[PDB]
Amino acid sequence: SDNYTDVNGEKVLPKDDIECPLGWKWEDEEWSTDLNRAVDEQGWEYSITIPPERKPKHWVPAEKMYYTHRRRRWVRLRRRDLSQMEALKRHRQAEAE
Amino acid sequence: RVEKYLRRRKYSLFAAFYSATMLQDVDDAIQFEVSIGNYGNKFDMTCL
């Protein structure tokens, strides 16, 4: 569960723990495997043990014995109520606290 | 686009040997070795 990250490598929740924000409904209740990336048929990309920078630079679709990490991108969609976006500014005032 | 075409699956092969005849000039005991590609070669392995 600690292997879920954002684009910057920062920890995020597991894909199955994500809920839809107020004023929005899910278009996709489940996460779709991203096959649009340089990944294998299972959506996985592979890489060498993460270097000292702790910020891995290279991933490939290929599986090798050299690779000790594997990653997938997941895609999920949501749609807003077709009324007003005034509600969207109500939960975005707390940028930091 | 080529690396993403790489995949591997487990395959199953079975072979039974029912008889062996018409041998000539046999000096010692006979063994056979059969392998698939680079797999099953007794000299390229320590444990299978």
How many CB pairs lie under 8 A apart between chains A and B?
A: 17
- In DSSP terms, which residues pair with A48 in a beta bridge? A67
Query: Is B3's CB within 8 Å of A60's CB?
Result: yes
Query: How far is Cα A42 from Cα A2, in angstroms, rounded to an integer?
Result: 20
Helix (H, G, I), strand (E, B) or coil at A73: coil
Distance, in angstroms, between A66 CA and closest chain B CA? 15
Tell me the resolution in Å. Answer: 4.7
Nearest-Å Rg of the Cα atoms of chain B is 17
Q: Does B9 touch chain A (CB under 8 A)?
A: no
Name the DSSP letter for residue B39. B
Q: How far apart are the first and last CA of chain A?
A: 26
Chain B residue numbers touching A66 (CB-CB < 8 A): none
Which residues fall within 8 angstroms of residue A56, CB to CB, at 6 or more apart?
A: A47, A48, A50, A69
| Rg, Å, chain A Cα set | 17
